[PDB]
């Protein structure tokens, strides 16, 4: 039966789940299987999906942008996780049920980020507020919120520059952004989005750790799931930090944004 242990272990390890979460899950699955005396494999798969389903049970909370004028969503994360694309998707996603959307460019560092979000804004036929490369981000986002309050915009999505968690000054910059955003509205931002790449390894734990210790992340978006990366580290960060998962990008297109579902994630995981 050791071959089954090795097989399951390898299957959990290649999913970038982590050795700690693997140890916990395997232990609980062992106790559960020993308790229920399951002699079949399908029941083992089912019990596994039940345990991991319990792991993802807390984070299944959907995102509600209703009730606030505007509803500010802060998109944060490391470099190249596709935050801007996620914003481009969320624009139409929030445009669909009749909520008015305005976009704000918070990356003045990277080249042609403003132009990119202006392209995504043009695709959604919605106004985009930005100034120039090199400008203060907090000021732009602030003016964006003020304008959103004056223009009665329902939903305002605020982009941020790609930043590594090991850099403290950028964290202080983001904290400055939040602090500035606290002026117009005390509960702003209402939604803090952490965009995590599916290909990311155990480093995502540290990313989510520092970003939560800083901005107080209220949510996590897992993109690039159209590859062979299942992003099993999300189980670890959901275990430790208990942060909800808002959506999952299935591709680069504007229609590729889907609401996060536990069952579908499980189906895509083992497949």
């Amino acid at each position: 039966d050791d071959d089954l242990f090795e097989e399951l272990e390898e299957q959990l390890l290649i999913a970038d789940v982590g050795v700690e979460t693997t140890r916990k899950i395997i232990t609980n699955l062992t106790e559960g299987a020993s308790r229920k005396q399951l002699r079949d494999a399908e029941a083992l798969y089912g019990l596994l999906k039940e345990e991991m389903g319990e792991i993802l049970a807390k984070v299944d909370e959907p995102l509600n942008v209703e009730g606030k004028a505007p509803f500010v969503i802060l998109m944060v994360g490391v470099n190249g996780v596709g935050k801007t694309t996620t914003i481009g998707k969320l624009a139409r996603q929030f445009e669909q049920q009749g909520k008015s959307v305005m976009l704000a460019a918070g990356d003045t560092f990277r080249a042609a980020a403003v132009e990119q979000l202006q392209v995504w804004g043009q695709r959604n036929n919605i106004p985009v507020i930005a100034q120039h490369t090199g400008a203060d981000s907090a000021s732009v986002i602030f003016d964006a919120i003020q304008a959103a309050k004056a223009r009665n915009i329902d939903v305002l999505i605020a982009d941020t520059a790609g930043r590594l968690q090991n850099k403290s000054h950028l964290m202080e910059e983001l904290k400055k952004i939040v602090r500035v955003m606290k002026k117009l509205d005390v509960e702003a931002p209402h939604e803090v989005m952490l965009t995590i790449d599916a290909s990311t390894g155990q480093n995502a734990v540290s990313q989510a750790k520092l970003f939560h210790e800083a901005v107080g992340l209220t949510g996590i978006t897992l993109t690039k799931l159209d590859g062979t990366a299942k992003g099993g580290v999300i189980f670890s960060v959901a275990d430790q930090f208990g942060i909800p998962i808002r959506y999952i990008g299935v591709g680069e297109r504007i229609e590729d944004l889907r609401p996060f579902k536990a069952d579908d994630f499980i189906e895509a995981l083992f497949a």
């Binding site: 050795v19 190249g80 990119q116 790449d197 990311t200 155990q202 480093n203 540290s206 159209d226 062979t228």
Partner: protein
């Protein structure tokens, strides 16, 4: 943690023997988990573990102090050897223009890498560089590459989303050949290995421009998917190297080891930052050195090891210099032992057959001669002693002037030293009994003294 775990493991399992396969179990397991937390591909982990076993069978560990330390040394050596060599560079020798093709997933930092390599090749290598964007997909990617090219002072080839990558890179190559550009940098769209159309696209591009350099750009935080990506990209294109980005993060970066093992392609570049001016060469030892955190444990150990090293070095060198053969050092020792023990009156009695032929009073006084010899030797530097064949006329002048005597006496003592060296060499080559019995008294005829 590595050193602590290995030391603990080797201590608790076995006492001091010579390390055997049975004792390396928990070691291999802890190293396995350490690499698993390092985001290293599991097959690479296993295949490395096998080599660790092969090195574990023949352990010389027993003679050292800390087994875990030297085991760490072995693992580090094997890992560095697995990472490849240093000074890995693109081939700019090539018949110009040199074409560099970029490949990787989405958000890999290929474009920023194009900017970095642009500035690097322009400033340092004094090369004329032309850059082009083959990406018609990502919004403002062409504008991004154009901006970076404008910042690094590198000419940019205009392109739009209404065109096709093939025609774009073909026109770029044609423009590079027409304007006599030294280096052609081709930036391409980030693509997934599961995408057929994009792979066929980059294959058609690679076939079109025939690049001398094909770089694979992968993130440092990449997980177990790095195996699939590296394998697929390696099978799809003949990679000439791998470019790792975002190394400045706190990420473990085992994906580098993964790709390096699977693809077999060396890493020629490490992105140290977001900015264009920030780039670093790949050092196997630096990357293989650190996945960890610790303190105060390694310092004392490295100190002790340094002490042992310098001690063994000096002690072996001292025996090596004295083991070269007979020199003026041993000649000096034999001369001072001579003048202290000098037996001229007694040695005249000790010798019998030589006294019957040669004159009885022909024996020279030991005191004067050997004091002269000692004092003249004292005028010589340590280098002229251990290496007597470098002595020349000017040195003889220095010696003679120092001792307050004539150069002919210096030449005389050098002659006597030559005789002593020859003799002792004959004593070392043969037997002391064959050589003592080979000593002959020269007589130029049977007439005495003639």
């Amino acid at each position: 943690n590595l050193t602590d775990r290995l030391s603990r493991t080797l201590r608790n399992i076995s006492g001091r023997g010579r390390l055997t396969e049975d004792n390396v179990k928990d070691t291999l397991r802890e190293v396995r988990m350490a690499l698993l937390e390092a985001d290293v591909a599991l097959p690479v982990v296993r295949e490395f573990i096998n080599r660790v076993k092969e090195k574990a069978v023949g352990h010389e560990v027993n003679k050292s102090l800390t087994p875990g330390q030297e085991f760490v040394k072995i693992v580090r050596n094997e890992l560095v050897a697995a990472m490849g060599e240093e000074n890995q560079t693109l081939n700019l020798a090539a018949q110009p223009p040199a074409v560099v093709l970029m490949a990787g997933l989405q958000g890999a930092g290929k474009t920023t890498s194009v900017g970095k390599l642009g500035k690097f090749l322009r400033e340092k290598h004094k090369k004329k560089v032309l850059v082009v964007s083959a990406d018609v997909y990502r919004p403002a990617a062409i504008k991004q590459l154009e901006t970076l090219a404008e910042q690094v002072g590198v000419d940019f080839f205009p392109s739009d989303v209404g065109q096709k990558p093939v025609d774009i890179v073909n026109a770029a190559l044609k423009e590079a050949k027409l304007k006599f550009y030294d280096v052609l940098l081709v930036d391409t769209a980030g693509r997934l290995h599961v995408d057929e159309a994009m792979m066929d696209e980059i294959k058609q591009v690679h076939a079109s421009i025939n690049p001398v350099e094909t770089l694979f750009v992968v993130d440092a935080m990449t997980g177990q998917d790095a195996a699939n990506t590296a394998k697929a990209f390696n099978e799809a294109l003949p990679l000439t190297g791998v470019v790792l980005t975002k190394v400045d993060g706190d990420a473990r970066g085992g994906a580098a080891l993964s790709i390096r093992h699977i693809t077999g392609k060396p890493i020629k570049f490490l992105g140290v930052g977001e900015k264009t001016e920030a780039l670093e060469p790949f050092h196997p030892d630096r990357i293989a050195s650190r996945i960890l955190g610790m303190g105060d444990v390694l310092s004392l150990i490295e100190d002790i090891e340094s002490k042992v090293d310098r001690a063994q070095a000096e002690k072996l060198a001292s025996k090596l210099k004295k083991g070269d053969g007979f020199d003026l050092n041993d000649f000096l020792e034999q001369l001072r032992q001579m003048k202290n023990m000098g037996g001229x009156x007694x040695x005249x009695x000790x010798x019998x057959x030589x006294x019957x032929x040669x004159x009885x009073x022909x024996x020279x006084x030991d005191d004067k001669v050997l004091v002269r010899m000692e004092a003249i030797i004292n005028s010589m530097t340590m280098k002229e002693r251990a290496k007597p064949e470098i002595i020349k006329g000017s040195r003889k002048r220095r010696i003679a002037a120092g001792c307050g005597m004539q150069v002919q006496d210096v030449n005389r003592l050098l002659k006597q030293f030559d005789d002593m060296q020859r003799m002792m060499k004959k004593m070392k080559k043969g037997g002391x009994x064959x050589x003592x019995x080979x000593x002959x008294x020269x007589x130029x005829x049977x007439x005495x003294x003639x």
